[PDB]
């Protein structure tokens, strides 16, 4: 009815310690979502096209020519870590549990309220907001996954991360097909490389409508749309990292010279010279058995061509990297490549009392030591002589192709059958929770953006829309735009994500690294005098585990 509430706000994370080792984490989350009517009730096909930044020869990577379909439907996305967990509750998954997997997911919409604004204006500019008890809210849940899957944490457009703050849904859109060609260049090319937007190939044309594919529920003011519980099937996510590269695997060499006075320059020594040692080498024709050339069971991590921009039917793109290296060789300005950089606004982690256009960024440096340091690689000849000459080694200093800023390790790939690598860690609060596996035949082993990948089916996307409140002067035969009563809707959303995590144990003598609060970050976790909140990023793989 009109004056009967249809739900309950619930925003508490509930740890149910079930049988030996395992916890049932039920993360409740509920928001107040503010939705106003779309600017147009049509499906446009807008082509985004810049020839001012990619037409200048030298920046091909500034290309964002695409074609898309802007829909009147909004998207209530909840696929980010901070929608569910406050920073005091990362804190208790992240240094108490060891692995973690994803169980179920629910979604509801309750206490729907639609209001119309109408200015009176004898001479104020003032507005009157009165309830519409018969206006409807159109809700469509794509439970069959017919729509294009557009995960909205890659654009930092999710529900907000604070429970006491109202949020907005995102004006859903999807990629239409286009063809284009961008021939690369630099600042000194002669002539003009081609920059043509061809059009749309009429075999890959796909125009989706929410009306023809989804059953839409029209929620009035007393109405509640609860979806089911979607049970996932994913692999478990490890909350522990690996410190071992391909140089700390196996049996160390027998130091038969041990340091007699403990200190900082008292090194132990292997008493055997390198050409007289025993062990398995894979180098075939050399008698040197050192720590670099001793045979390992596999290879940990891989090298990839960094800042390599491939091309395809519809423009250039960057090849993704799975890589992370924490502290030793990374300086503060350029840590690595392949470690993600997030940008976000005041709703999603920036301080809510900063007036500005620019977002807030961090670069997530993972704790897993599985990446590569390309300045320490070298390709040398098969003869393997004592100190190697210049025509028998390929350093990262010499030019490849004549370019002094391009060496061989910019095009180097050592993905092989012996490469072992780890999944991506969670990124609190901005990373995705779950992604959708590709509908190809040979699926990738990783997704760079989410730790959980739903193989068979993903949760259905929830689309909301304000039903058209028309005025009395309407006819569908005029080419001019439709005239509507200006309506907006404030409904309440509530999700419930269930995890299942395993409590960590103490294997080693020494204490491991734990996420804490201290003097230099005590003020990221409390408000500040105006109500300015923020959620700073936290690491997710704090504890170490042995790879071998």
């Amino acid at each position: 009815g009109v004056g009967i509430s249809t739900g309950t706000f619930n925003n508490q994370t509930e740890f149910k310690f079930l049988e030996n080792g395992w916890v049932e984490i039920t993360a409740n989350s509920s928001r107040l979502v503010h939705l106003n009517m779309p600017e147009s009730e049509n499906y446009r096909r807008v082509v985004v096209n810049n020839m001012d930044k990619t037409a200048v020869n030298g920046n091909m990577a500034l290309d964002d020519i695409h074609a898309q379909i802007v829909t009147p439907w909004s998207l209530v996305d909840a696929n980010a870590w901070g929608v569910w967990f406050n920073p005091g509750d990362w804190q208790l998954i992240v240094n108490t549990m060891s692995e973690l997997h994803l169980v179920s997911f629910e979604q509801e919409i309750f206490n729907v309220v639609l209001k119309t604004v109408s200015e009176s204006a004898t001479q104020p500019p003032t507005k009157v907001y009165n309830n519409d008890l018969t206006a409807s809210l159109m809700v469509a849940l794509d439970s069959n996954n017919t729509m294009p899957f557009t995960p909205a944490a890659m654009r930092s457009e999710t529900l907000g991360f604070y429970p006491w703050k109202p949020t907005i849904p995102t004006p859903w859109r999807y990629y239409f097909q286009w063809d284009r060609t961008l021939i690369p260049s630099h600042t000194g090319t002669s002539g003009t490389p081609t920059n043509i937007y061809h059009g749309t190939d009429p075999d890959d044309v796909q125009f989706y409508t929410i009306e023809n594919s989804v059953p839409v529920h029209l929620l009035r003011t007393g109405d509640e749309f609860a979806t089911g519980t979607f049970f996932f099937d994913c692999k478990p996510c490890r909350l522990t990292h690996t410190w071992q590269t391909n140089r700390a695997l196996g049996l160390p060499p027998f130091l038969n010279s041990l340091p007699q006075s403990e200190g900082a320059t008292n090194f132990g020594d292997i008493g055997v010279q390198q050409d007289k040692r025993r062990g398995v080498t894979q180098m075939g024709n050399t008698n040197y058995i050192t720590e670099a050339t001793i045979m390992r069971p596999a290879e940990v991590g891989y090298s990839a061509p960094y800042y390599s921009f491939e091309a395809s039917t519809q423009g250039p793109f960057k090849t993704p990297i799975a890589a992370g290296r924490g502290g030793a060789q990374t300086d503060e300005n350029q840590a690595a490549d392949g470690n993600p950089r997030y940008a976000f606004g005041r709703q999603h982690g920036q301080k809510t009392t900063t007036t500005g256009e620019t977002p807030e960024r961090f670069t997530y440096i993972a704790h897993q030591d599985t990446g590569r340091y390309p300045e320490g690689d070298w390709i040398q000849n098969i003869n393997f002589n004592l100190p190697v000459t210049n025509d028998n080694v390929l350093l990262p200093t010499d030019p490849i192709g004549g370019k002094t800023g391009i060496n061989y390790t910019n095009i180097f790939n050592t993905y092989g059958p012996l490469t072992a690598l780890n999944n991506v860690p969670p990124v609190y609060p901005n990373g995705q929770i779950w992604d959708k596996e590709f509908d190809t035949d040979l699926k990738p082993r990783l997704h760079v953006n989410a730790p959980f990948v739903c193989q068979n089916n993903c949760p259905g996307q929830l689309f909301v829309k304000v039903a058209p409140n028309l005025t009395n002067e309407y006819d569908p035969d005029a080419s001019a735009n439709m005239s509507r009563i200006v309506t907006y809707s404030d409904f309440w959303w509530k999700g419930k994500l269930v995890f299942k995590a395993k409590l960590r144990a103490s294997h080693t003598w020494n204490p491991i690294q734990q996420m804490s609060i201290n003097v230099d970050n005590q003020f990221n976790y409390v408000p500040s005098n105006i109500g300015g909140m923020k959620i700073v990023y936290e690491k997710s793989q704090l504890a170490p585990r042995k790879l071998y």
Partner: antibody
Amino acid sequence: AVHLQGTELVKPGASAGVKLSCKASGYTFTNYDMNWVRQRPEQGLEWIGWIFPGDGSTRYNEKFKGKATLTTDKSSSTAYQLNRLTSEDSAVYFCARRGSHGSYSFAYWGQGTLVTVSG
Amino acid sequence: DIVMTQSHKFMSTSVGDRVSITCKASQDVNTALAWYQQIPGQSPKLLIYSASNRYTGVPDRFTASGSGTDFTFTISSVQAEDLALYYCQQHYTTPWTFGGGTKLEIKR
């Protein structure tokens, strides 16, 4: 038909700034950034910075950081430049646009707008 | 910041001759160099871009060459309207820096 139209010759005092202008014509304004070039009669030509009218992406050089700020006025096809300090910088200020090629070699310039700062 | 040095401030020319204006850069620009002609009191005019290519409508007596640090500008038959200030600009990296300028003048 592409044509740039600088403002008239200004006479400021040596305390404040005076805004210059350059109305573009004969081409779509948003496809090309407007570069500003200063020509002192002693120092040759000096590039100040560009401004894309596509949501205002500026660059400058380091000797013109707090010295001049570039804006544009969309839907009127004109550019601007404040020249905030204006101490000894009496020169001809040029309004340059790239051209058909793609390299940063200015094909269409303005007519020049002489600033004369003095006491 | 690449500094650009032109080899002469003034080059004595006869009408009908062959003049070689030279610009030398500090850092190795690949071709990345534009040539400008400015009669004084007027806006400069783009003649050469990318150190070899002629702009559309520029007459064919102006040729240019060079790659690396040494560049040259050539007028095969110097005429009356070719005696101006000749400028050298690099479109390699930001900030774009101009040359010192070279004034073609009459051999007295």
